[PDB]
Amino acid sequence: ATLATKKATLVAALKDLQRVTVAFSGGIDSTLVLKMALDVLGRDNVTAVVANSELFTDEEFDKAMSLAEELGANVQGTTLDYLSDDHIKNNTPDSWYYAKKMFYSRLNDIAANNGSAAVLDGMIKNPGLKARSEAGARSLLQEADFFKTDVRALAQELGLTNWNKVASCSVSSRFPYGTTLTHDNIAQVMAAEKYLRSLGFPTVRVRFHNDIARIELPEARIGDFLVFNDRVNRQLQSLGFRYVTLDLGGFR
Amino acid sequence: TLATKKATLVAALKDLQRVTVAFSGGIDSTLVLKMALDVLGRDNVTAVVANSELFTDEEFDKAMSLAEELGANVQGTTLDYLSDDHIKNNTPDSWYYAKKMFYSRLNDIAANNGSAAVLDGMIKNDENDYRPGLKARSEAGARSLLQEADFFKTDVRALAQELGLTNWNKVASCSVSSRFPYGTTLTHDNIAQVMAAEKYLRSLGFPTVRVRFHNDIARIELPEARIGDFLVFNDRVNRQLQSLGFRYVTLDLGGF
Amino acid sequence: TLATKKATLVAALKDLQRVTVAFSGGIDSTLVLKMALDVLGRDNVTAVVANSELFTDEEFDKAMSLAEELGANVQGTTLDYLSDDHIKNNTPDSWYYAKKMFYSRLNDIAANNGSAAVLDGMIKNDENDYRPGLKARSEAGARSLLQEADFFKTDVRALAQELGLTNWNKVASCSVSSRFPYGTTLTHDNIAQVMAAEKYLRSLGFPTVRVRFHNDIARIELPEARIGDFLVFNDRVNRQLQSLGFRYVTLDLGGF
Amino acid sequence: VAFSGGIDSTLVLKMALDVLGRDNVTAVVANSELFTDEEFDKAMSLAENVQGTTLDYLSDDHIKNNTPDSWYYAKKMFYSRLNDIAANNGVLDGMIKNLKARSEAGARSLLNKVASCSVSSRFPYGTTLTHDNIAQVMAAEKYLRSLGFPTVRVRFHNDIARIELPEARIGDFLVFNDRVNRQLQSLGFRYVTLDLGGF
Amino acid sequence: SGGIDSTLVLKMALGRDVVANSELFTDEEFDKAMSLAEELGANVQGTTLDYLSDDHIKNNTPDSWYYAKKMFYSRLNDIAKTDVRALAQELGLTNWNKVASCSVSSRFPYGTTLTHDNIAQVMAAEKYLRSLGFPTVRVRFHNDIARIELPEARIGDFLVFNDRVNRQLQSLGFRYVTLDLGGFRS
Amino acid sequence: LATKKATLVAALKDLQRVTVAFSGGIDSTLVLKMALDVLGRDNVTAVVANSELFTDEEFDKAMSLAEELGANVQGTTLDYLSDDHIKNNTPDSWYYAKKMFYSRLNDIAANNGSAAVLDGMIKARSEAGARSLLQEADFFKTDVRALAQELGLTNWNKVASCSVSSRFPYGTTLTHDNIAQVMAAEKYLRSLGFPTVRVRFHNDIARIELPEARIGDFLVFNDRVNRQLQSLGFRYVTLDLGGF
Numbered sequence A: 001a002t003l004a005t006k007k008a009t010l011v012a013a014l015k016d017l018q019r020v021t022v023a024f025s026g027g028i029d030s031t032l033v034l035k036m037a038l039d040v041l042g043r044d045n046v047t048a049v050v051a052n053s054e055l056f057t058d059e060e061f062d063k064a065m066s067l068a069e070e071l072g073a074n075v076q077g078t079t080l081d082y083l084s085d086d087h088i089k090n091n092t093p094d095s096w097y098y099a100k101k102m103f104y105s106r107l108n109d110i111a112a113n114n115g116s117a118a119v120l121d122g123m124i125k126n127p128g129l130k131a132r133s134e135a136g137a138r139s140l141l142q143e144a145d146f147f148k149t150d151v152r153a154l155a156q157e158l159g160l161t162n163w164n165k166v167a168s169c170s171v172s173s174r175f176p177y178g179t180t181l182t183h184d185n186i187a188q189v190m191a192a193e194k195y196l197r198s199l200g201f202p203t204v205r206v207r208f209h210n211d212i213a214r215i216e217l218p219e220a221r222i223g224d225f226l227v228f229n230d231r232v233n234r235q236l237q238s239l240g241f242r243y244v245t246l247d248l249g250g251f252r
Numbered sequence B, C: 001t002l003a004t005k006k007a008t009l010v011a012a013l014k015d016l017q018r019v020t021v022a023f024s025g026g027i028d029s030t031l032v033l034k035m036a037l038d039v040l041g042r043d044n045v046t047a048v049v050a051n052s053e054l055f056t057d058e059e060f061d062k063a064m065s066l067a068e069e070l071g072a073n074v075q076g077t078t079l080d081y082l083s084d085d086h087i088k089n090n091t092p093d094s095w096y097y098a099k100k101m102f103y104s105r106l107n108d109i110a111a112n113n114g115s116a117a118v119l120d121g122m123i124k125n126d127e128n129d130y131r132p133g134l135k136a137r138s139e140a141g142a143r144s145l146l147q148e149a150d151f152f153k154t155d156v157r158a159l160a161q162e163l164g165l166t167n168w169n170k171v172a173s174c175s176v177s178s179r180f181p182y183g184t185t186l187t188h189d190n191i192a193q194v195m196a197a198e199k200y201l202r203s204l205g206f207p208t209v210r211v212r213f214h215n216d217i218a219r220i221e222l223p224e225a226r227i228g229d230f231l232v233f234n235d236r237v238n239r240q241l242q243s244l245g246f247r248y249v250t251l252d253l254g255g256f
Numbered sequence D: 001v002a003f004s005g006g007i008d009s010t011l012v013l014k015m016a017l018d019v020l021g022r023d024n025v026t027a028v029v030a031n032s033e034l035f036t037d038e039e040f041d042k043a044m045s046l047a048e049n050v051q052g053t054t055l056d057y058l059s060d061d062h063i064k065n066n067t068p069d070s071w072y073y074a075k076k077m078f079y080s081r082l083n084d085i086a087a088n089n090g091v092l093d094g095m096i097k098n099l100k101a102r103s104e105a106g107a108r109s110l111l112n113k114v115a116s117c118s119v120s121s122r123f124p125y126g127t128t129l130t131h132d133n134i135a136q137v138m139a140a141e142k143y144l145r146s147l148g149f150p151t152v153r154v155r156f157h158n159d160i161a162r163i164e165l166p167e168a169r170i171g172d173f174l175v176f177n178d179r180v181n182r183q184l185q186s187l188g189f190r191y192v193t194l195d196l197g198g199f
Numbered sequence E: 001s002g003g004i005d006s007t008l009v010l011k012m013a014l015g016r017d018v019v020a021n022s023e024l025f026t027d028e029e030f031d032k033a034m035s036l037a038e039e040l041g042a043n044v045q046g047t048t049l050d051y052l053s054d055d056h057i058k059n060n061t062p063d064s065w066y067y068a069k070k071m072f073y074s075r076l077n078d079i080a081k082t083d084v085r086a087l088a089q090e091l092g093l094t095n096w097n098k099v100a101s102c103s104v105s106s107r108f109p110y111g112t113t114l115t116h117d118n119i120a121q122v123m124a125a126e127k128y129l130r131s132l133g134f135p136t137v138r139v140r141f142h143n144d145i146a147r148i149e150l151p152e153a154r155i156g157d158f159l160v161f162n163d164r165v166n167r168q169l170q171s172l173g174f175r176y177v178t179l180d181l182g183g184f185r186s
Numbered sequence F: 001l002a003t004k005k006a007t008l009v010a011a012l013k014d015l016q017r018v019t020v021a022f023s024g025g026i027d028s029t030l031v032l033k034m035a036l037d038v039l040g041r042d043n044v045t046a047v048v049a050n051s052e053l054f055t056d057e058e059f060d061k062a063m064s065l066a067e068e069l070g071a072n073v074q075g076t077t078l079d080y081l082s083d084d085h086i087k088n089n090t091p092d093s094w095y096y097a098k099k100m101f102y103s104r105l106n107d108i109a110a111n112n113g114s115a116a117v118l119d120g121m122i123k124a125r126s127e128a129g130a131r132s133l134l135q136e137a138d139f140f141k142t143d144v145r146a147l148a149q150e151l152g153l154t155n156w157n158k159v160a161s162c163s164v165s166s167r168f169p170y171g172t173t174l175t176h177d178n179i180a181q182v183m184a185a186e187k188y189l190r191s192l193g194f195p196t197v198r199v200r201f202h203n204d205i206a207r208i209e210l211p212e213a214r215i216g217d218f219l220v221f222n223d224r225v226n227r228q229l230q231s232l233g234f235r236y237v238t239l240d241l242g243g244f
């Protein structure tokens, strides 16, 4: 049905929960959930949580905390010691689950000490349902059948105009499976990717291959990048890399 | 006087009592449907969106969604634009003969409906004598009510921004006949071939692009600032458009 | 603590009764204009846009449209900045004497207007040394209400989101005097030469660009991330700028 | 000996000078409307007793309509004149291993680095060759060559010029787009385009 | 060798009455030298050296080049700068082999045991980049990663080959095809 | 072909003894190899000039090409910047400099007994009586290349040379410092693979002229060139959109 019907289902779902804990990330999807809950149950029944960690840029954390305070929410940060778990630490292919389990556990621990009834996520329509459906996490946008267009159409109708546009992934995605994640090499990748991002390339991955960095750019951009070759070479060589290379196939 | 142009818009609707509005998804066509719904009621306004071979179904399907979200009884109609030999052979005036067939069907669905006349969303800005669709409209006896109630391009945003209106189609369209030189005959096949070649180009990250049809030669129009960023895709675009039927894939050294 | 920040704004607005607003099109000046319109009424608010030799008319017209569409009684005023020999000779303290001349005219527009105070849209974020207008603004008794209710850039983003404000001017400006070395004096001629070079560069597809004036040499500052996409426009830009008066047109290897 | 400036035709002339003498050996260089005059002039200079003759290739209705056999008919028409210049002068070619007209005229195949082709190779076979469009194609190529692209083809498709460049070079070409666009439009082309494929 | 030095020796040298070919050199080097030698008019005969035989060359120690050179001169024993260009250019000195070859062992890291199979894909990787018009080019061998050193001045000329260069080095065995952001040795 | 040539040997044989002004270019070389082959090693004297206006790199390659060809070569040093016209870069400087150049040559030629001064062209010459035999022998740019490839000439200077005073606008005073700064910025650019390049001097602005076919390839060296030239004294390093 209409966007307005997809919304009555969202507002009806919030009133029954009366009191929620929102896992807020700053993304458009996560933002629309927080503002809607703020508009329904009030600041006293809604607690916004932004999780920082070793695997995610602190720039992202600081922007998500700030964007939440701007919405008028009571925001609380929590930091996950992801590398303490050995699955995440050794970068098994199942690592992205074990971090999500640590994530929804901490959310439910904050949810229990908070008055909140459930934990809300901001995922939408169009890889692990074994993890949300273990901590009783609710994907409210996904339940009212919101796609990315239903989300922009409702956000642009709430006057919401601020969020994080370049989306992130767990920095573990930069290391081949089997390589063990250390603070040293993790800091090294995020340092290089922060630099590439500062040259005007918001989507970039520096893949880690010991002494060789392999830069994944969107093919549309590999042309604009040549002016920065020599600087990126010096800059990434200074971060520990012996050889700085660019993947001819690009990002994705 | 912003509301002195709003009352003039609302007052004309009551005299008509019943209407059938041609909705295209744009901001202009949308403010027409919302005001008619708010003035004449959900039962006295019938929404029509036209699909055709000349427009992507993406644009068609997005307009039908924009109507369901607005809450009107919306209905699609399919025009066989290629039945008229003018459009099929792409005479230079074929833009007119196509718009006439459009308002022809529009007068037919509304006459069967309770509507008195058909309303479109043209504005005083589109008050040019060289704007094509007005001719057929004033022939088919339709009406551009916002243009009559004195709305300009920024004067429409202020009523849109005041009805909380948004969620309208922002990406603008053309009849695909613009890709064919005057005289070339339009078939389903080559129309499909043109629209396929262009979707591929956009999906590489080039939203503004034209694949101009010249029998065996494809002539690509990109915005000149992007031709630098385009080289990395030359060979792939070459082979991909060649598979759609083109023998030569070329890039216009001119712009857009 | 935004719920009580808005009230501080209204209480200051209600106390002034009649105000003259310096509107620039920016988000900051808009929320002040929109708030003062909502509090004192259309007849008790006068919005002023300043045109001058140092800013494009392109900007002036977009601010006049944003004010008229916002629902203000909008009024233009024209400043002869090159009359003050400080602005003219481009000493580093120029943008002060320009700010000083700006607030004087505004206080005169306000003095004849029923307005009690001159409000500008400065905020708490720019409550610092090293920002030009602040000295001149205060020495003139201009009131920055957003600054007084302790609005920061984020508190301003959030109050807009509750007045349905989703339209303001995003392209930020510089005084064109930034394009001339400190010794160079400003002519009506050389400003237009520079302002034209940048508008053409902007037309091609470089909205962020600077043309640095060095008598016969124009130095173009482009964002390095884009200097690759500019190669196709070399010859065009070289020709078009030579006709504006520059003997040599160059591109700065450093960047913006 | 029929001289083209090539190494093959060149070795014959020097040997013919060394074997039969300058007065008993006659050098012939061909002009035409199908080849650049720069090519004609260097062959007469590379020979410098040389004598020029101009062949009316477009008189032949096959060459004029650009059948795939035009290359034959131009070769057939070439040796026809070669047997005629010999009658007043009192014909040798330089083919070297590696025609159905060359042997159809009693020519003997006894055996400049930048090589040339018939400008008919720029026209699709259906396209008919006129003096006008041949002149534009050869001019458009000269302009391209003058920009620093010694290897270039301007393919003629009526309204459309289709430029074939060496792919390695398309990057260095962007700075010249507008100039090439305008310069070939004044030479008659409505649309100037670049083949995304290659040479 | 074909160069200006070895050419002058043939044409200067006694009456009319050897160019090697090895795995570690393109057969192009051996083929153009035998054409450049028969051109000066001499009887030219080839010999081939199984360099992988000696354990130093194949183990890829920095003591390869010495050891590698030593196995060269042995079969030679078996089968039997401004002043030099001034005696060459008086003889109508035609051409010299300017483009210098390199042992392909330089494409592999010090210690990487040399296979025919991975040597092969290096020299294939290099021929392919050369055919597209990059005479100066090295494909450096990091197991699954191909690192391509192009002369920095030619990297803007390279972008049209990226996906094509990519999928083709992949079909030779590389899992990853990269372009060194630093260029050629220089 | 041998006609343009016959005029040359009759002219050289008529002089018997000459003095040849060598620049390293293909033209001056065909003049020098021919005079050696016609008049002998003892009757021809090759002169190369060093100065502030030409890189010493170029000078030394000029002396080498003469020693390899077999001429008795002689260097000489011109104090161009002494002349107030060259130093202040008046528009007539090109002339007063060429006037000074052929002046030292006619005296170095008058001193060694030679009959005329030969240069290799194909109002500065006619005031000194400098004979241009390739132009007198009916040589064009194609006629000069062809005689070299037929005389086995395989080494000459391909990178063309200019007096550095052309990089300075008219009126700018040339200082010893100012010439070296320009000469260095150009050597750096050349070392990146741009043998054809000019760094135009504009006080704080360096304006780089590249052949347009190559400006596409230069973008990777933007930053390197920007800093390297800023360290040589230029406040702003820019690229001329015109090209060379």
Ligand SMILES: Nc1ncnc2c1ncn2[C@@H]1O[C@H](COP(=O)(O)O)[C@@H](O)[C@H]1O
Binding pocket: A022, A023, A024, A025, A027, A029, A030, A049, A050, A051, A052, A056, A120, A121, A122, A123
């Ligand atoms: N750093 C984060 N802090 C708090 N909540 C988050 C965070 N990341 C994701 N969430 C939730 O995860 C949803 C999307 O998941 P994902 O795209 O995998 O990060 C968001 O809409 C939020 O509900």
Ligand SMILES: Nc1ncnc2c1ncn2[C@@H]1O[C@H](COP(=O)(O)O)[C@@H](O)[C@H]1O
Binding pocket: B022, B023, B024, B026, B028, B029, B048, B049, B050, B051, B055, B119, B120, B121, B122, B133
């Ligand atoms: N595909 C379409 N289907 C139904 N009505 C349309 C369509 N396109 C345009 N209309 C009408 O045409 C007006 C604008 O004309 P145009 O933008 O040229 O197609 C809109 O405001 C609608 O009233």
Ligand SMILES: Nc1ncnc2c1ncn2[C@@H]1O[C@H](COP(=O)(O)O)[C@@H](O)[C@H]1O
Binding pocket: C022, C023, C024, C026, C028, C029, C048, C049, C050, C051, C055, C119, C120, C121, C122, C133
């Ligand atoms: N051209 C202008 N015309 C009228 N008012 C202005 C103008 N520029 C600025 N104002 C006001 O002065 C403040 C400071 O402007 P700025 O120095 O550009 O940040 C703005 O936020 C407006 O309130």
